[PDB]
Amino acid sequence: MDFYYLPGSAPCRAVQMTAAAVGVELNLKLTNLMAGEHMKPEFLKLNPQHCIPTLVDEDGFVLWESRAIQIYLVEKYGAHDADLAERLYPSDPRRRAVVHQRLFFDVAVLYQRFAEYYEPQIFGQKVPVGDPGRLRSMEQALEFLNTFLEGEQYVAGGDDPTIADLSILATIATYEVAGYDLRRYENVQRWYERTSAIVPGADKNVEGAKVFGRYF
Amino acid sequence: MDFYYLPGSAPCRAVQMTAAAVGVELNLKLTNLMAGEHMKPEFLKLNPQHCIPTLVDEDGFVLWESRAIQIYLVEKYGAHDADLAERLYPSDPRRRAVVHQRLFFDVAVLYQRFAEYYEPQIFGQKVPVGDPGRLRSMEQALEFLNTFLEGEQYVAGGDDPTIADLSILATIATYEVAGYDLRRYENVQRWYERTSAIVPGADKNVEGAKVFGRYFT
Numbered sequence: 127m128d129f130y131y132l133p134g135s136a137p138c139r140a141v142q143m144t145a146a147a148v149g150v151e152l153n154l155k156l157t158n159l160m161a162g163e164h165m166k167p168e169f170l171k172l173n174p175q176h177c178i179p180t181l182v183d184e185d186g187f188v189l190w191e192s193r194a195i196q197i198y199l200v201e202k203y204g205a206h207d208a209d210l211a212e213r214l215y216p217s218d219p220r221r222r223a224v225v226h227q228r229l230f231f232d233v234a235v236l237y238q239r240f241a242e243y244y245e246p247q248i249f250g251q252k253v254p255v256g257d258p259g260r261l262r263s264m265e266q267a268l269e270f271l272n273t274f275l276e277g278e279q280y281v282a283g284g285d286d287p288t289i290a291d292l293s294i295l296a297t298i299a300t301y302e303v304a305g306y307d308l309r310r311y312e313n314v315q316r317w318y319e320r321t322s323a324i325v326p327g328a329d330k331n332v333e334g335a336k337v338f339g340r341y342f
Numbered sequence: 343m344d345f346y347y348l349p350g351s352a353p354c355r356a357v358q359m360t361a362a363a364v365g366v367e368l369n370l371k372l373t374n375l376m377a378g379e380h381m382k383p384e385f386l387k388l389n390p391q392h393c394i395p396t397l398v399d400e401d402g403f404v405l406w407e408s409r410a411i412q413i414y415l416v417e418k419y420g421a422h423d424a425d426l427a428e429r430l431y432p433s434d435p436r437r438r439a440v441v442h443q444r445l446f447f448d449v450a451v452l453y454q455r456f457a458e459y460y461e462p463q464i465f466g467q468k469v470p471v472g473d474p475g476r477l478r479s480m481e482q483a484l485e486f487l488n489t490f491l492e493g494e495q496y497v498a499g500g501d502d503p504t505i506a507d508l509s510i511l512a513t514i515a516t517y518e519v520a521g522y523d524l525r526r527y528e529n530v531q532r533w534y535e536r537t538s539a540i541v542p543g544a545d546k547n548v549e550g551a552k553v554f555g556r557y558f559t
């Protein structure tokens with residue numbers, strides 16, 4: 127399976143942790159966005175949305191959006207270990223609803239506001255001073271996550287990390303390298319330390335996050 | 343089942359269409375966001391993210407994010423009709439991945455870029471002259487959708503509308519009612535017309551969108 131990725135990219139790292147958890151190797155294909163490699167006719171034919179991560183399965187199926195890829199990996203390549211797939215992606219509709227909820231929270235709120243705050247600080251204008259509105263917004267997202275983790279081990283509940291934890295771990299590892307003091311959010315910091323110690327490929331998440339950290 | 347919502351809200355309308363498809367009757371609870379009804383202590387207890395739509399099910403289980411609600415409606419409350427659930431939310435991992443991919447596209451790209459430009463105008467934060475980047479962003483998003491719909495009846499493929507169609511139907515209705523010219527996107531217009539003609543609860547999508555349209559008089 128061809129995996130078009132960048133080590134520094136959070137959504138790429140979330141798929142990497144998921145693939146390691148289900149036990150499938152990825153054919154790593156580094157796609158330099160700065161050299162416009164995502165804009166070459168070869169990549170565009172595969173992915174008109176020209177974004178990473180992009181997964182190309184051996185049957186020719188092309189898939190993007192990291193969280194769609196996460197679910198796909200569990201559903202297709204996790205069947206060999208029912209209990210594992212169940213831990214990562216519980217089949218009970220109510221339990222799965224919270225997992226889905228947190229996945230959408232990650233893309234639309236937690237990672238989104240992170241990007242809306244730090245991308246102006248490292249690209250284009252490169253302003254070191256962060257907009258007070260964008261900071262308030264991003265902190266509100268951390269406030270939300272902290273509340274979700276109140277009296278809970280993991281982001282969508284349960285006794286084991288789910289793919290929602292893997293997605294948000296990639297995201298929050300990026301928060302850490304960006305210089306944000308996560309210790310302000312005691313539940314988040316506790317969860318971040320817990321999850322990093324136990325999930326497969328977590329060391330490769332910290333490793334890739336540091337590559338993103340070169341921008342600051 | 344309690345449904346905290348506003349008719350003008352696209353994500354709310356996507357849930358309404360999904361519930362109509364699986365025969366779920368929602369107890370509609372108008373949540374006036376301008377009056378701060380979503381910031382009231384009782385609502386915050388249910389939903390600390392203080393956002394609509396919010397579903398409270400028969401056991402008091404609380405769920406928000408429209409697309410997670412959509413899935414929950416099909417998986418749990420659509421399971422009485424195996425064939426219908428399969429049309430709305432196919433179980434094949436590849437087909438389901440495209441549905442998921444399109445749902446994420448809607449939240450993170452299509453609706454996201456819409457809201458960034460148009461939603462300020464609801465709150466009164468409308469700037470008469472703005473950044474060209476915000477306009478290019480919506481154009482680009484609509485180009486992607488039009489490309490996905492090339493040679494295809496529906497947004498995630500297949501012979502029937504999925505929850506991805508209902509999500510994007512609610513979003514595109516909002517584009518149209520806000521005044522966006524969709525004519526350069528022939529596949530989008532064609533898909534919108536044909537999908538709106540056949541999906542249950544489509545009337546309330548149009549009606550609800552019109553309520554949103556009253557902000558752009």
Ligand SMILES: CCCCCCSC[C@H](NC(=O)CC[C@H]([NH3+])C(=O)O)C(=O)NCC(=O)O
Pocket residue numbers: 132133134135136137138159164175176177178179190191192193233337338450
């Ligand atoms: C050091 C690493 C720097 C990269 C960090 C940004 S991730 C790159 C970006 N990808 C995305 O934002 C995809 C997000 C998508 N929601 C997902 O989760 O997969 C991209 O391909 N953007 C280019 C494009 O969309 O055209």
Ligand SMILES: CCCCCCSC[C@H](NC(=O)CC[C@H]([NH3+])C(=O)O)C(=O)NCC(=O)O
Pocket residue numbers: 234348349350351352353354375380391392393394395406407408409449464553554
């Ligand atoms: C009458 C039409 C007025 C326009 C309403 C826009 S939707 C309102 C908004 N909700 C959302 O954007 C939720 C989006 C979420 N991604 C979903 O799909 O459910 C909200 O509750 N915002 C309040 C908040 O989050 O605090």
